[PDB]
Design a protein around this ligand. Structure first.
Ligand SMILES: CCc1cc2c(n1Cc1ccccc1)CCCC2=O
Length: 127
C-alpha cells in the first residue's frame, strides 16, 4: 500500500504574510491543541500504511493534520488567518467523515475542536 504525497508546506511563489492573527493562530491556537493529551494522532499526516487504513485516501481527498499546519505557520506559508482556520476545520471534518460517532478518534477530535472554537472566538482584530 501507499501514502499520497503530503500537503504542500513550502511554495516560494505563493505570496505570504506574518500578521497578528496568524501569530495568534501559532502562539495560542496551534500550541494549545498541540500540547493536549489527544493531539498525538493529529500531529502528522494520516499514515494509511502503518494504520492499515487502505481506504483512507479513497475517502479523504483533502488531507490535513496539525503537523502540516505547524509547518505552514512556522514557515509563514499563509496569506491570512482564514486559510489556516480552514486547515484546522478540514482536519476535524476529515475525521468525522472517515470515522463513526463515538469512536475514540472522533472523541479526540471533538475535544480538540472544542478548544479550537474557544480560541478562535477570541481571534484578535487585525493590526
Ligand atoms: C480507524 C483508525 C483511525 C482513524 C484515524 C486515526 N486512526 C487511528 C487511531 C484511532 C484512535 C486513536 C488513535 C489513532 C488517526 C488519524 C486520524 C483518523 O481519522
Amino acid at each position: 500500500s501507499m501514502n499520497p504525497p503530503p500537503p504542500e508546506t513550502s511554495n516560494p511563489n505563493k505570496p505570504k504574510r506574518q500578521t497578528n492573527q496568524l501569530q495568534y493562530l501559532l502562539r495560542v491556537v496551534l500550541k494549545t491543541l498541540w500540547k493536549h493529551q489527544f493531539a498525538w494522532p493529529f500531529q502528522q499526516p494520516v499514515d494509511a500504511v502503518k494504520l492499515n487504513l487502505p481506504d483512507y485516501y479513497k475517502i479523504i481527498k483533502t488531507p490535513m493534520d496539525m503537523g502540516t499546519i505547524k509547518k505552514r505557520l512556522e514557515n509563514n506559508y499563509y496569506w491570512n488567518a482564514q486559510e489556516c482556520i480552514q486547515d484546522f476545520n478540514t482536519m476535524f471534518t476529515n475525521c468525522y467523515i472517515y470515522n463513526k460517532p463515538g469512536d475514540d478518534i472522533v472523541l479526540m477530535a471533538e475535544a480538540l475542536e472544542k478548544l479550537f472554537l474557544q480560541k478562535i472566538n477570541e481571534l484578535p482584530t487585525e493590526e
